Design a protein around this ligand. Structure first.
Ligand SMILES: O=C(O)[C@H]1[C@H](c2ccccc2)[C@H](C(=O)Oc2cccc3ccccc23)[C@H]1c1ccccc1
Length: 134
């Protein structure tokens, strides 16, 4: 996929806005939130066949998801939520939906001026994270 290629790279977190409140709305407790706030992840996005693969490396733990665009799959998040998830293209954007325990959250990945911007929404709580190619 052409639009996915813009995301395919090794990325490092450079800025985060309101992620603590976002985690709080998800139900993450204070201490685990501290882990989420201090960790600096390395995020590798790639295309392998018809699958998109997102590998995240950090001291806390490493995660890996592999999916076909628009196909629902089971996802265990870094905070151990067991979700039904789907990642789809919306124009040039990647939209990731996570459903668990009757709840729903979504986040959007965009390439803007060569950087990756992730906007996360749960209810009316919004967080924004910036990443740059490593
Ligand atoms: O930035 C990313 O893409 C990923 C980071 C990461 C992953 C694995 C290990 C450590 C960090 C974010 C993140 O902080 O995860 C959480 C870590 C700890 C607790 C968390 C609680 C709730 C939610 C995330 C947590 C990962 C990420 C992926 C997709 C959307 C937002 C954040």
């Amino acid at each position: 996929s052409h639009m996915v290629e813009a995301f395919c790279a090794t990325w490092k977190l450079t800025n985060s806005q309101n992620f603590d409140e976002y985690m709080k709305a998800l139900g993450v407790g204070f201490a685990t939130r501290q882990v989420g706030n201090v960790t600096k992840p390395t995020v590798i996005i790639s295309q392998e066949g018809d699958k998109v693969v997102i590998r995240t490396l950090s001291t806390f733990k490493n995660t890996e998801i592999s999916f076909q665009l628009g196909e629902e799959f089971d996802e265990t998040t870094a905070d151990d939520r067991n979700c039904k998830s789907v990642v789809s293209l919306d124009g040039d954007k990647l939209v990731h939906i996570q459903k668990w325990d009757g709840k729903e959250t979504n986040f959007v990945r965009e390439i803007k001026d060569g950087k990756m911007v992730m906007t996360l929404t749960f209810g009316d709580v919004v967080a924004v994270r910036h990443y740059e190619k490593a």
